[PDB]
A paper describes a structure:
Our studies focus on the homologous adhesion proteins α-catenin and vinculin, which are major ABP components found in adherens junctions (α-catenin and vinculin) and focal adhesions (vinculin) that are critical for the force-dependent strengthening of cellular adhesion and mechanotransduction. Approximately 3 Å resolution cryo-EM structures of both proteins bound to F-actin (to our knowledge, the highest-resolution structures of ABP-F-actin complexes reported to date) reveal they share an overlapping major actin-binding site. Next, we compared the metavinculin ABD-F-actin and α-catenin ABD-F-actin structures, confirming previous low- and moderate-resolution studies that both ABDs engage a major site spanning the longitudinal interface of 2 actin protomers, which we term Actin I and Actin II (numbered from the plus end of the filament).
Using the Iterative Helical Real Space Reconstruction (IHRSR) approach as implemented in Relion 3.0, we obtained reconstructions of the metavinculin ABD (residues 879–1134)–F-actin complex (left) at 2.9 Å overall resolution and the α-catenin ABD (residues 664–906)–F-actin complex (right) at 3.2 Å overall resolution. We find that the α-catenin ABD also undergoes an order-to-disorder transition at its N-terminus upon actin binding, as no density for residues 664–698, the majority of H0-H1, is present in our map, confirming recent reports that this region is important for activating α-catenin’s actin engagement. This is accompanied by a twisting rearrangement of helices H2–H4 reminiscent of that found in (meta)vinculin, as well as the extension of H4 by three turns (nine residues) through folding of the H3-H4 loop, to sculpt a major actin-binding interface sterically compatible with the filament. However, we observe distinct rearrangements in the α-catenin CTE, which undergoes a slight lateral shift and helical unfurling, rather than a swing, to engage a site spanning a different surface of actin subdomain 1. By contrast, the α-catenin CTE retains an overall conformation similar to its pre-bound state. An extensive hydrophobic network we term a ‘tryptophan latch’ embraces CTE residue W859 in both pre-bound and post-bound states, preventing α-catenin CTE unfurling. The latch positions the neighboring region of the CTE to bind a distinct site on Actin I’s subdomain 1 mediated by proximal salt bridges (α-catenin E865 – actin R28, α-catenin K866 – actin D24/D25, α-catenin K867 – actin E93) and distal hydrophobic interactions (α-catenin L869/V870 – actin P333/Y337). By contrast, density for the α-catenin CTE is only present until K871. Consistent with previous primary-structure-function analysis showing that residues after P864, which bear no homology to vinculin, are necessary for actin binding, our structure shows that residues 865–871 are in direct contact with actin, forming an extensive interface.
Author numbering:
A (entry chain C), C (entry chain A), D (entry chain B): 4 to 374
B (entry chain L): 699 to 871
Write the structure that this text describes.
């Protein structure tokens, strides 16, 4: 009765569904495209915004905007179009009778979740609401209560170290390098062969390139010496207009900026010594249980060979007696949602919602106290 | 651990229930070294949905003792472990449906036995470690408040719990 | 039938068991830890106090406190949590049907056993009770009736000289320097090599260092001259995260403050000339029997070479014709308990308990007259 | 004739000058920056290290490293570049004919001053040397010989209680929470308003924020209730590119971690019950002369309202008859240097140097005996 909704509204992809299930009912990209050309036929027009899946079948006449950049909602009029699309047009539910479980990255602005609270209560009129952290929900879905979670998505990657249900907020690190900064590095790195992708609708083609041909080399300075001696690493890809491109050493140079972020001009360290500098800011008694429970979540952690590369780079930093086990589940793209369906369908969680009656005695500043 | 092995099978309802759950957990423990009746991943999922049902009945039996305690100063150590087994069986129900669909969609080659079914063993080891504290916190609340009206109606004397006195500590070495 | 309990509740460790046995049934640390981090998972929480052995496996998220400092119980609400833990949760007995034998240091405040006699009667409802001195119980465990007892625990050390079962109260000396003040000197002495242990969960690591690597030198200013010429004394210890530390001449400089308490800024004399000043405050006729029976008890008297060193120093103070024998049994950590199970299981002792009806005619001041 | 040098080489700032003066001749930051970008113009290059003041005008193409972290010199090749810069390029002296007075924190590793002695004698070839403690030299600069010195710098804070020229080493407490750990808390606390400072050249902008807008609240839980009711506490700051940021209750939440160190994740107590716990470890006869002479030194003790706050917090712990006077001079940033110029220019001090002749019979271990 009154099954809750779990809407993980990440950057780049929106995953929604019902609480208590094991798979999302709605996975569509988080874009709102508007037409940029001149309409000549009468009737084609009077429709100035395509949201989600029909803005990628009809791209090529649209300019595609992302409302969430770096985990922060930049466009508050286009984010209401995606929430209106994912309730009525995509899930086919009425939000007046279901409580929703939203999802936010750590270390975001406090006025980002202050306006998600205002929108769901004064526009969609949900009975109850709750805003959770991403990397705490990918420990629910992993069968653990202790561990350190590297959650690499599209806007941000962050580490949250948790020991026996107790989080250490002084050791939560956050990078703004993520998967969308590997798409924009692949557009620049492909111009050395002649292929120039420019437009916003041509960035979705080079995004589909990195999901199919890109991988992580276990030894980078050796792999660049065998990518030039022979041509056994090259693979071909067919564009939507029939042209065939050929990619050589740009298959592993694109996910290598997660481990060497000096390729994009960032001064920060890689993701292998960000997940280690946050272990070494935890207390000494719990470091043996974080080396062995190293949960990897999110979509950008799905390259072939990102687990065997990351075990190589923490064992070179950790002491030689610790064993290091990296937990990469096969379904780790939807791990943040599955732990959201676990938490919202819980028997002891049902007194932790922010009810609509509670929203009147406070303002939108109640979400900081209750979450 | 070996504390459950030191209990007798002719006890009351809670002791005979916590003896069956350690027999299920011992079938998933040796699967990490491959010496059990559970041969592949498809039997670990059927056992994890079995230990999540037997562990969901001690949440029922543990709450018939927690409400009969007269004052609220003694059940704080009992409700703290009854809320942990509410979480550890909800993970065992949902993360067994998830690992059943991954085994069904991608096939049997995606799961690898060891290092793939360890998400169910780790959530079941934490259920067993939070159910032997539920026996020990319910044994205290059943004998410290035995003479009060309401607790004697459950028919739980101190002799029904078959837990013995501990061993002598070693003097040297 | 109605076997008595013997709860030797010192600082640092709690040893309990049944009277008449030869070994305690329950040895656990005397700490009550409370969580200091932020709990994120629902259910992981609502348990705000961990007592005993389960607060050392879960340290690293707790702040560990000691209710007894310097032999005096400072926290009377955390001391009830340890007595409730060692009756129901650790010994699995009912206190309403067993008489208990508690244990207290000499020269303590009189409102320390006036409140132990109130909690055991009005909260745990024991039928009978008795409070004994620590160093009079470690003469039963040696098979003697004469002797001088150096009982070095975790809070205090004290010498009680006893001849033919007659104690001399004017010659009882007490130091507040004990095993906990050697741990806090080992944290300060280890900063000279770079290792900084700060937190309350990091003091249990440097306490496990001194139980493994520390030893008493037979000649201090000769051993300090060979620790600098070579590295023949350096031994390595492995921290809980896998780091290996190396300790050289801090192995014998830590138990040397028992013999030179000017290292920690105390004015008082060492344990070798505070057990001689208490001999020389006795009668002259009984000094020959105290020089030969020098009982050493407590856990802090278990360093390798504290019997060979202390015999060297009292010989240099006593006259040259008296023989000096120091009795250090191999089970001397539990000598105060073994004499507690001897005294409480005696046939003559059974008319010396403080019964519950005797607590009703008097107040809590009954314990001052009967003990 | 042969006037001595006094180099107070603290973390974060280097103050140098001549002994006998009233002000330092050289105050520059202790950073060594190396370029991280690609040089295209020929000639503009071949300079891989900028030290001191020209590594802050040229930041934005550099990566700024600090060679001293927590009072301990971590990089011994970057520290030789700052001593070479402060003798020749900044003071314009020849170190072969001036004796230098260095300066070290208490409770440091013993191989820290064993390598300052090796470098100053075998590389810079000074005639004499002496290494003094920081918090004793800030008693010369106050005209006192009794008192307790809180010396809050950039790496460490420490209390040294001194009564009539006699120091009490068992009551010297040392924290690792200092001014650099309030910069790193201000970077995390400013992400709640949207501003994200990441790079090492962007940590110097948020360090200049806390030197201009940060203050200490007299009552923290009252000021946090009037920071939310209105906007009378907010002040604007202009970034180096012209952007204007607005800071509200992050003005007093940043120096509040000195009095509540549980904000940054540390367990240890504040600076108000570290300067009181070290008073209560001295003798009872000298406690009245330390409550009245409470010297505050260092740069982190210069927030507006840290003297009126700290008198409020020790009078709530001290007995009600002892009067408490906290002595914060207006020039307390350079108090450790001024006492260095007082001590090195003394007539009695001139036989306490470590001359180069004395360095040859011993090793670098002479500095432990003569200091
Ligand atoms: N096979 C793949 N290899 C590499 N990156 C991938 C792959 N599949 C998806 N991604 C990346 O994962 C991101 C989308 O997955 P997800 O982490 O759920 O996104 P978000 O957190 O933005 O909702 C995109 O940046 C996409 O490029
Ligand atoms: N093997 C050992 N070697 C050296 N010191 C020890 C050893 N075992 C214990 N200690 C020290 O003595 C203490 C044990 O004293 P104990 O008799 O247990 O104290 P209490 O009187 O409080 O029960 C430890 O906390 C430690 O400081
Ligand atoms: N007005 C100010 N308010 C707050 N902090 C200040 C102020 N001026 C300087 N500081 C801090 O003082 C430190 C530098 O001064 P100082 O104590 O001499 O440094 P160090 O001890 O590292 O040489 C830095 O941490 C700086 O942020
Ligand atoms: Mg995500
Ligand atoms: Mg004792
Ligand atoms: Mg300084």
């Amino acid at each position: 009765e009154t099954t809750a909704l779990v809407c993980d509204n990440g950057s780049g992809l929106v995953k929604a569904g019902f609480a208590g299930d094991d798979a999302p009912r709605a996975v569509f990209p988080s874009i709102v495209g508007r037409p940029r050309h001149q309409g000549v036929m009468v009737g084609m027009g009077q429709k100035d915004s395509y949201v989600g899946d029909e803005a990628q079948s009809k791209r090529g006449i649209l300019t595609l905007k992302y409302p969430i950049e770096h985990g922060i909602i930049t466009n508050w009029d286009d984010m209401e179009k995606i929430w209106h699309h994912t309730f009525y047009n995509e899930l086919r539910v009425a939000p007046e009778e279901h409580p929703t479980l939203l999802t936010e990255a750590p270390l975001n602005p406090k006025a980002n979740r202050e306006k998600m609270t205002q929108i769901m209560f004064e526009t969609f009129n949900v009975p109850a609401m709750y805003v959770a952290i991403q990397a705490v929900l990918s420990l629910y879905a992993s069968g653990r209560t202790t561990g350190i979670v590297l959650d690499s998505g599209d806007g941000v990657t962050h580490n949250v170290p948790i020991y026996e249900g107790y989080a250490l907020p002084h050791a939560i690190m956050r990078l703004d390098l993520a998967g969308r900064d590997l798409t924009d590095y692949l557009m620049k790195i492909l111009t050395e062969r002649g292929y120039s992708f420019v437009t916003t609708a041509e960035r979705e083609i080079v995004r589909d390139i990195k999901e199919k041909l890109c991988y992580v080399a276990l030894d980078f300075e050796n792999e660049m010496a065998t990518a030039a001696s022979s041509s056994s690493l090259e693979k071909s890809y067919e564009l939507p207009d029939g042209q065939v491109i050929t990619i050589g050493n740009e298959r592993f140079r694109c996910p290598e900026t997660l481990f060497q972020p000096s390729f994009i001009g960032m001064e920060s360290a890689g993701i292998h010594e960000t997940t280690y500098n946050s272990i070494m800011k935890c207390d000494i008694d719990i470091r043996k249980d974080l080396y062995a429970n190293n949960v990897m979540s999110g979509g950008t952690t799905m390259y072939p060979g990102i687990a065997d590369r990351m075990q190589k780079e923490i064992t070179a930093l950790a002491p030689s007696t610790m064993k290091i086990k990296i937990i990469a589940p096969p379904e780790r793209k939807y791990s943040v949602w599955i732990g959201g369906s676990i938490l919202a369908s819980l028997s002891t969680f049902q007194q932790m919602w922010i009810t609509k009656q509670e929203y009147d005695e406070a303002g939108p500043s109640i979400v900081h106290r209750k979450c | 651990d070996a504390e459950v092995s030191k209990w007798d099978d002719s006890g009351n309802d809670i002791i005979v229930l916590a003896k069956q759950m350690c027999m299920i957990m011992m079938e998933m423990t040796d699967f990490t070294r491959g010496k059990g009746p559970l041969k592949n991943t498809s039997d670990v999922i059927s056992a994890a949905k079995k230990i999540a049902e037997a562990g969901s009945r001690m949440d029922k039996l543990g709450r018939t003792i927690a409400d009969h305690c007269p004052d609220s100063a003694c059940k704080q150590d009992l409700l703290a472990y009854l809320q942990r087994i509410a979480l550890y069986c909800h993970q065992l129900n949902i993360c067994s449906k998830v690992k059943a669909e991954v085994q069904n969609l991608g096939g049997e080659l995606v799961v690898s036995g060891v290092d793939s079914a360890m998400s169910l063993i780790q959530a079941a080891k934490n259920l067993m470690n939070a159910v032997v504290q539920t026996v020990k916190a319910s044994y205290v609340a059943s004998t410290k408040y035995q003479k009060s009206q309401g607790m004697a109606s459950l028919n739980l004397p101190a002799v029904s719990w078959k837990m013995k006195a501990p061993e002598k500590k070693p003097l040297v070495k």
